[PDB]
Amino acid sequence: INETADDIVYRLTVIIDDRYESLKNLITLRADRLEMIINDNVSTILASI
Amino acid sequence: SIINETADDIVYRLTVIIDDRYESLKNLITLRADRLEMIINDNVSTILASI
Amino acid sequence: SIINETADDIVYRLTVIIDDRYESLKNLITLRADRLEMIINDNVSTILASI
Amino acid sequence: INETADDIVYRLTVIIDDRYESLKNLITLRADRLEMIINDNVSTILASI
Ligand SMILES: [Hg+2]
Ligand SMILES: [Hg+2]
Ligand SMILES: [Hg+2]
Ligand SMILES: [K+]
Ligand SMILES: [K+]
Ligand SMILES: [K+]
Ligand SMILES: [K+]
Ligand SMILES: [K+]
Ligand code: NA
Ligand code: NA
Numbered sequence: 001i002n003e004t005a006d007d008i009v010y011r012l013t014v015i016i017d018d019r020y021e022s023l024k025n026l027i028t029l030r031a032d033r034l035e036m037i038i039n040d041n042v043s044t045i046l047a048s049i
Numbered sequence: 050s051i052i053n054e055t056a057d058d059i060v061y062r063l064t065v066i067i068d069d070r071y072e073s074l075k076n077l078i079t080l081r082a083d084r085l086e087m088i089i090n091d092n093v094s095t096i097l098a099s100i
Numbered sequence: 101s102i103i104n105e106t107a108d109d110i111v112y113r114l115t116v117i118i119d120d121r122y123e124s125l126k127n128l129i130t131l132r133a134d135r136l137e138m139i140i141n142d143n144v145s146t147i148l149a150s151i
Numbered sequence: 152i153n154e155t156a157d158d159i160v161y162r163l164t165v166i167i168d169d170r171y172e173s174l175k176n177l178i179t180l181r182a183d184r185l186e187m188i189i190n191d192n193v194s195t196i197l198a199s200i
Contacts, residue, residue, distance in 0.1 A: 001052055001152060008110070009162045011060045012067070019071035020170040024177055026075060030082035031181040035188060037086060041093045042192050048097060049151070049199055055107050062111050063118075070122035077126060081133035088140050092147075100151055110159045117164060121171040128175065132182035139189040146193065151200040 005056050008056050008059050008159050013166050015064050015067055016166050016170055023174055027177050034085055037089055045097045051103055055103050059107050066115050074125055077129055085136055113160050128178045143193045
């Protein structure tokens with residue numbers, strides 16, 4: 001139960017990393033998106049005043 | 050082998066818990082992020098067209 | 101049982117810990133994504149005042 | 152085996168906290184990112200508008 005029942009830590013890390021990397025990537029994507037839906041749009045309201 | 054059949058249930062039950070919070074966070078961020086677009090395109094239609 | 105109580109222990113002890121991180125992450129996302137309208141609805145009014 | 156194998160929670164809490172603190176730093180990073188861009192862009196428009 002020592003050299004075998006360590007999967008509860010390891011197998012969960014495989015899960016928690018996948019959810020973390022999907023969270024980390026999605027936050028980065030959506031935040032970069034809003035930054036490209038701001039600096040792209042503010043340059044248009046500035047290009048007309 | 051109650052050992053193997055138990056550690057698989059722990060990984061499973063926690064997977065269902067861990068997957069639940071990810072989806073809750075995923076939908077929350079996606080909902081909030083799209084809401085921030087609803088408050089960004091609302092100014093482009095207002096301050097560019099009509100001012 | 102004896103192994104069902106140690107399986108329910110680590111599952112429960114982690115379930116609230118994940119709920120600790122999840123609800124905390126939920127608070128961070130909500131807080132800041134609630135500020136971005138405080139930094140828009142209060143910021144749009146300045147562009148509406150001068151133009 | 153004795154009674155408790157709390158290293159399961161321990162060495163997993165090492166993972167949950169590490170991924171959380173990473174996601175904690177990520178959200179705090181982007182929320183500060185869009186904050187400067189909320190200020191720099193707003194102050195940029197206030198010149199000619
Ligand atoms: Hg065990
Ligand atoms: Hg929407
Ligand atoms: Hg910045
Ligand atoms: K990138
Ligand atoms: K669904
Ligand atoms: K609606
Ligand atoms: K044991
Ligand atoms: K800052
Ligand atoms: Na804690
Ligand atoms: Na905490």
